[PDB]
Design a protein around this ligand. Structure first.
Ligand SMILES: C=C(C)[C@]12C[C@@H](C)[C@@]34O[C@](Cc5ccccc5)(O[C@@H]1[C@@H]3C=C(COC(=O)Cc1ccc(O)c(OC)c1)C[C@]1(O)C(=O)C(C)=C[C@@H]41)O2
Ligand SMILES: CCCCCCCCCCCCC(=O)O[C@@H](COC(=O)CCC)COP(=O)(O)O[C@H]1[C@H](O)[C@@H](O)[C@@H](O)[C@@H](O)[C@@H]1O
Lengths: 536, 79, 80, 80
């Protein structure tokens, strides 16, 4: 085809689609180009149009459709064998395509894992010196990195625990068994491109996901990742986390002390008196502003490094947004302070409040507290927002009714009546707060209707809905806790402030000692003991 | 019977308008009681804003659940 | 969690208040605590400037603690 | 309110010569696992008198499954 929609499609592609082994054999026999790239729009992702992306190549097409016989033929035909390492216009190989077509369903994932395995075996058999799994597409992603980024948990789970029991394919494995006693045996996970690598370490890809990856909560449950994160935590990060928490606590105490003893004279900035208390006060103020600047620049670092696309900028990393807002309030307070405006106080208190509230960020890393904080966040985003919309509609409607009814009274104003009706919500509503009206029956009927709708119905409904929510987000909260542990571990090991290399764990062990050549393979493996009472 | 077991929003908007018209009649009738009518319409008007929560997936469900809570649980409880 | 919130907003409010009857961490802490037991005054002082800031802080505290946290506690106990 | 019968009819597909024209669901193209089907929509969107959507929506509230019938695939996608 020459049209842009089916561009590049030929007889071989059609033969593969129809699953006709005979026609494929004849076409290859007749000199068909096994590398003919079908790169029309119909064979691209292109979400706004129909299509089917399969890597544009006949080998990739056979692999994606669970046609193993055609794959073996295309790789090992006499007339024109296919290039196993060929790449499409995106740079994707067959393995990248197999990652792409994954969707974590049992039937899809089963054959996707099996075909991926078979391709690896064949690639070893035809090209022992070729390392397919290191090839990157135009995005720099290996098949493992692509699977981790796209959330294809099934494929990732297969790869990370890949063990191949046959001669001359042992080196492809990533899970090894070093020694075995009876029910107990000690396995080794490879951890290359998991712990640390050039660009797309799997932990870094998962933790810094865009929050729209399907299974980002579940991917860290995979055995080697969870054990590695726990090891990093216990060995290196736990004490540092506690230290950071302690330092933040000291910072908040200092900020509180500095703000509490602010002077009450007008027109800042204030002349420093030659007395001990004021030297300590100004010192605390300087430390507070310093911390504000620190968190400000960390926030900018976050935004630039992650480049959230204006929706990921808010729906996730809620904590960094809040810390950044605290720093903004601190800096605006500084500007107003040196601007000779009293309004700096109005900024400072907000920062102070935010600071103490942001203490809850450090609840994560405790299994029980972090779930609590996670549920707070999710409730604020969903249920409190919906409730506040409805409640404010009722509040404003009945406030307007009551303030209209009242005439030439103390209240007689939208603010006062809104406040006085709000007092019903907190269990302080007077219910006789004024007599400056006519038609007392109308007044009392309005208040009773408001009370029944808001206090009795809506608040109790809110409690019921929050119960329904927690019943559904308990397990999601558990996985989110694990996710944050992963995130803090990565940030701690990447910042590290001291060029300390002990964070690199698991030790340089020898896996096989016999690569495709005579060399020996050292792969920094991570040891995991297991016990099993079957398969003696 | 279908007039009352279903189509509550039509009832509520119609009743609001009835309160408004009664307010007009009282207003030109030289009775201060028009205020008593007007405020009721005003209150109902704002609550009828919830009618428009349909067309939003998140809020529409919430409005439906409020409707069902009123019709079942609040009615039983208030009795 | 509640004590974190209470202390944070008490510190903010007592910072905002100046040369008033309350003007002290203990009294303001107690006064904000009164909201939890359904006795919060919500206009317990005028010894400040920036009425908008003070009332905003009190409303935010009320919503965060009284509305969200207590009902959330009920939900968590129900799960337990 | 006979949801089962309606659910059958609206996605009815007949695979034989001289009875294709009775079908209301068609498959235009099917490439790999992906295939583009077509729903007939005669007298669902608009009809002489009793369009299916009009009948369901303006039902008398005593129909059994009036809430559930819009879960039938072509209707839900059409309404969206
Ligand atoms: C979500 C946005 C960014 C938000 C930021 C500020 C302005 C905030 O007001 C809100 C608006 C608001 C205020 C009061 C009631 C409802 C909503 O809610 C939060 C935000 C509301 C919060 C919620 O408290 C928390 O987020 C604790 C927390 C939970 C999980 C986290 O990962 C976390 O990271 C630090 C912090 C506290 C305030 O920051 C706060 O203490 C002050 C004085 C106002 C609250 O805006
Ligand atoms: C003095 C002031 C008092 C205010 C009193 C009123 C408070 C609520 C006001 C909120 C307004 C919402 C609204 O306008 O109506 C809502 C809520 O109704 C009520 O709860 C009134 C309680 C009486 C649902 O109305 P809806 O039109 O969707 O009815 C549905 C049909 O359409 C649909 O086909 C189904 O058959 C479905 O079973 C039907 O329900």
């Amino acid at each position: 085809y020459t049209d842009s929609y089916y561009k590049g499609q030929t007889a071989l592609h059609i033969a593969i689609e129809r699953r006709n082994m005979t026609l494929v054999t004849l076409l290859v026999e007749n000199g068909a180009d096994v590398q003919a790239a079908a790169n029309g729009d119909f064979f691209k992702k292109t979400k706004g149009r129909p299509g089917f992306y399969f890597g544009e190549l006949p080998l990739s097409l056979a692999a994606c459709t669970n046609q193993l016989a055609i794959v073996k033929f295309l790789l090992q035909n006499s007339w024109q064998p296919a290039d196993i390492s060929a790449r499409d216009s995106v740079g994707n190989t067959v393995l990248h395509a197999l990652v792409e077509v994954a969707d974590n369903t049992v039937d899809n994932t089963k054959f996707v894992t099996s075909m991926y395995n078979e391709i690896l075996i064949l690639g070893a058999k035809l090209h022992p010196t070729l390392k397919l799994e290191e090839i990157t597409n135009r995005k720099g992603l290996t098949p493992l990195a692509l699977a981790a980024s796209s959330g294809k948990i099934g494929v990732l789970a297969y790869i990370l625990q890949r063990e191949i029991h046959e001669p001359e394919c042992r080196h492809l494995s990533r899970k090894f068994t070093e020694w075995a006693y009876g029910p107990v045996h000690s396995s080794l996970y490879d951890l290359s491109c998991i712990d640390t690598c050039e660009k797309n370490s799997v932990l870094e890809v998962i933790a810094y996901s865009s929050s729209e990856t399907p299974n980002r909560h579940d991917m860290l449950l995979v055995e080697p990742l969870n054990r590695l994160l726990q090891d990093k935590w216990d060995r290196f990060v736990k004490r540092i986390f506690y230290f950071n928490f302690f330092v933040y606590c000291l910072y908040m105490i200092i900020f509180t002390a500095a703000a509490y003893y602010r002077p009450v004279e007008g027109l800042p900035p204030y002349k420093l008196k030659n007395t001990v208390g004021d030297y300590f006060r100004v010192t605390g103020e300087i430390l507070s502003v310093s911390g504000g600047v620190y968190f400000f620049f960390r926030g900018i670092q976050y935004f630039l490094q992650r480049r959230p696309s204006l929706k990921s900028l808010f729906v996730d990393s809620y904590s960094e947004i809040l810390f950044f807002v605290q720093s903004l309030f601190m800096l605006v307070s500084v500007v107003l302070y040196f601007s000779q405006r009293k309004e700096y106080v109005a900024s400072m208190v907000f920062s102070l409040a935010m600071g103490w509230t942001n203490m809850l960020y450090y609840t994560r890393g405790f299994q029980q507290m972090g779930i609590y904080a996670v549920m707070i966040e999710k409730m604020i985003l969903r249920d409190l927002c919906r409730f506040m919309f409805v409640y404010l509609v009722f509040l404003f409607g009945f406030s307007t009714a009551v303030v209209t009814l009242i005439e030439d009274g103390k209240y007689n104003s939208l603010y006062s009546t809104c406040l006085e009706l709000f007092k019903f919500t907190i269990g302080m509503g007077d219910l006789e707060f004024t007599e400056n009206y006519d038609f007392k029956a109308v007044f009392i009927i309005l208040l009773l209707a408001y009370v029944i709708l808001t206090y009795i119905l809506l608040l109790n409904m809110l409690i019921a809905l929050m119960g329904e929510t927690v019943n559904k987000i308990a397990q999601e909260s558990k996985n989110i806790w694990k996710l944050q542990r992963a995130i803090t571990i990565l940030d701690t090991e990447k910042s590290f402030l001291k060029c300390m290399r002990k964070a690199f764990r698991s030790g340089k062990l020898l896996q096989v000692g016999f690569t495709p050549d005579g060399k020996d393979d050292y792969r920094w493996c991570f040891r995991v003991d297991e016990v099993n009472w079957t398969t003696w």
